[PDB]
């Protein structure tokens, strides 16, 4: 009834007992040393420890420590020192490993939540996920895991209750074992489903505003769109948004259109205005639409794919907004290759530069009309360079999402490695719970129990190979 009882499997000659022992010591010491190195690197790098997105690492390594050191300690008090273990110390030894596994699963759970918030709700990530909140969540998860592991030590064994208990694990009631297996299994299944959903949704959503989803060329697409709108070929301007006063300057655009209608250039200019709002501005837009044959107004609901096609067909996009906090319209237009004539206010200033669009003073219809005339004059020459610059600038803003998806993929890899390592052991434990066993199952369980140490070995390798920040910190410490 000793922890890590090696008395079984007398097949091997005592000659290789020393080899097995030295291999076990080397593996345990290597795991402990690399876990300590990872923890030191994390703690001594101020950039790394202040990022919640990496906090899971600081948890996992600690868990990898808890399951490693104890093992080495649990190997010292049996072979080199023959000190027999009582019930309480054996329960503590098993509780350490169970707490380590539960902490690993909980760290993966918290990391999955953080990844979902970071990838699919970016606009909230810097506010919902703060460092104190992440620290509190990780501490709560660790305390929950510790309590679950300590429960048998507080009176949930098969001696105090006087009930039938497991064979592979003495002094441990089967009901507690079944409860722990069920908890970890349902948590792992939910984490797997969450990671699959996150990865699939990120794949289908992030790579949407791209030119690869359209067929043909720019000129033929624009000609077909204008034919569908019953207009001749010309320099096309597009406005999409809200019909209101104060947020988006659709009134400014209408005044600029009225000003430009008195010139001779208005004959070689097409306008599309898309949106819904107050009846007054919609009526003004419809009056302009019926007055001029090169102006089109759409108030209905447009599908995402139709807007994507529109962005990849028109020449310029006008964004005369008074208050634009994010400028996602500009981001989509520049991703799909459309030169933006946007107001220089809010979040449009840092997205658009003087070589990747035109910037306009907010709330000045005359200045907007002058900028539109400048864009029309610029359209006389080639414009492919501006489209390429806009695409490059727009893709420059999508790097963070790609890094987040890479971190999510790394987490999925860590999760699948954990599943492979801890699979057969949990299967044998369930077979223990459901029914009886033979000596062969006990032997294979004792042989497969080293997969936990292999997992603790390979986790730092994954962390070092995947994340560039940890490598940079490690080289900085050297």
């Amino acid at each position, epitope marked *: 009834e000793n922890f890590m009882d090696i008395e079984c499997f007398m097949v091997l000659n005592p000659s290789q007992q020393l080899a097995i022992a030295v291999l076990s010591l080397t593996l345990g010491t290597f795991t402990v040393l690399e876990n300590l190195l990872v923890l030191c690197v994390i703690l001594h790098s101020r950039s790394l420890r202040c990022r919640p997105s990496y906090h899971f690492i600081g948890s996992l390594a600690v868990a990898d420590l808890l399951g490693s050191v104890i093992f080495v300690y649990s190997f010292i008090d049996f072979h080199v020192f023959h000190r027999k273990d009582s019930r309480n110390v054996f329960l503590f030894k098993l509780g350490g490993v169970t707490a380590s596994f539960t902490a690993k699963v909980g760290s993966l759970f918290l990391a999955a939540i953080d990844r979902y918030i970071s990838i699919h709700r970016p606009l909230a990530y810097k506010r919902i996920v703060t460092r104190p909140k992440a620290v509190v969540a990780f501490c709560l998860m660790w305390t929950i895991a510790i309590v679950i592991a300590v429960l048998p030590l507080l009176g949930w064994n098969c001696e105090k209750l006087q009930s039938v208990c497991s064979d592979i694990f003495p002094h441990i009631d089967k009901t507690y074992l079944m409860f722990w297996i069920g908890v970890v299994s349902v948590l792992l299944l939910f984490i797997v489903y969450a990671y699959m959903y996150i990865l699939w949704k990120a794949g289908i959503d992030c790579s949407f505003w791209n030119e690869s989803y359209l067929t043909g060329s720019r000129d033929e697409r624009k000609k077909s769109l204008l034919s569908k709108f019953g207009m001749d070929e010309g320099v096309t301007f597009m406005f999409i948004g809200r019909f209101d006063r104060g947020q988006k300057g659709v009134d400014v655009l209408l005044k600029a259109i009225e000003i430009l209608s008195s010139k001779k250039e208005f004959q070689e200019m097409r306008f599309i205005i*898309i949106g819904k709002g107050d009846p007054e501005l919609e009526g003004w837009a419809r009056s302009l639409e019926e007055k001029h044959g090169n102006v089109k107004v759409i108030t209905e609901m447009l599908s995402r794919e139709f807007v994507r096609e529109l962005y990849g067909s028109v020449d310029f996009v006008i964004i005369p907004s008074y208050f634009e906090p994010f400028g996602l319209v500009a981001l989509e237009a520049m991703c799909l290759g459309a030169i933006p004539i946007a107001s220089a206010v*809010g979040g449009l200033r840092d997205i658009i530069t003087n070589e990747t669009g035109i910037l306009v003073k907010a709330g000045d219809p005359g200045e907007l009309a002058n900028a539109i005339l400048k864009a029309l004059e610029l359209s006389r020459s080639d414009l492919s360079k501006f489209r390429e610059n806009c695409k490059k600038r727009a893709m420059s803003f999508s790097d963070q999402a790609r890094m987040d998806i890479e971190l999510a993929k790394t987490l999925v890899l860590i999760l699948v490695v954990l599943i492979i390592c801890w699979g057969p052991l949990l299967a044998i434990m369930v077979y223990d719970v459901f029914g009886k066993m033979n000596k062969l199952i006990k032997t294979v369980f004792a042989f497969c129990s080293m997969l936990c140490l292999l997992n603790s070995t390979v986790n730092p390798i994954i962390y070092a190979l995947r994340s560039k920040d940890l490598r940079h910190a490690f080289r900085s410490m050297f």
Partner: nanobody, 121 residues
Framework: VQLQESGGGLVQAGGSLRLSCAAS????????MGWYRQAPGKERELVAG???????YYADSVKGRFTISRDNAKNTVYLQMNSLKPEDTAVYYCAAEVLDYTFAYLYHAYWGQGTQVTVSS
């Protein structure tokens, strides 16, 4: 979501007030917050807007006088005005915009009950 408004009331000309608006959302609540004003016999007008930090917007009639701030601990917005004028008497509304990232054209707007502000000389 739901928005609770407070701080309206009568005041002497040239005074100073601060209204507060608290949102109750699922995840971060609103992404953009704003204060609108409606004078009697007049159209509703946006008086202030904010997203986070120094991303605020102010109407030309309150530039330099009003100040909008946001607290993420309680997810609430404050609007503090100094040197009030009789022209500033109106009903103030709190607006909250939750906008999508995968489609810039999609958004949802929520409004408050509105509170009266009367500057009297």
């Amino acid at each position: 979501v739901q928005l609770q408004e407070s701080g309206g009331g009568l005041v002497q000309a040239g005074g100073s007030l601060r209204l507060s608006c608290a949102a109750s959302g699922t995840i971060f609540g609103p992404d953009v917050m704003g204060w609108y004003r409606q004078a009697p016999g007049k159209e509703r007008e946006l008086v202030a807007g904010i997203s986070n930090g120094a991303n605020t917007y102010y109407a030309d009639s309150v530039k330099g006088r009003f100040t909008i701030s946001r607290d993420n601990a309680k997810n609430t917005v404050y609007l503090q005005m100094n040197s009030l004028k009789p022209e500033d008497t109106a009903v103030y509304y709190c607006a909250a915009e939750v906008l999508d990232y995968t489609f810039a054209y999609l958004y949802h707007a929520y409004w408050g009950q509105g509170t009266q502000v009367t500057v009297s000389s």
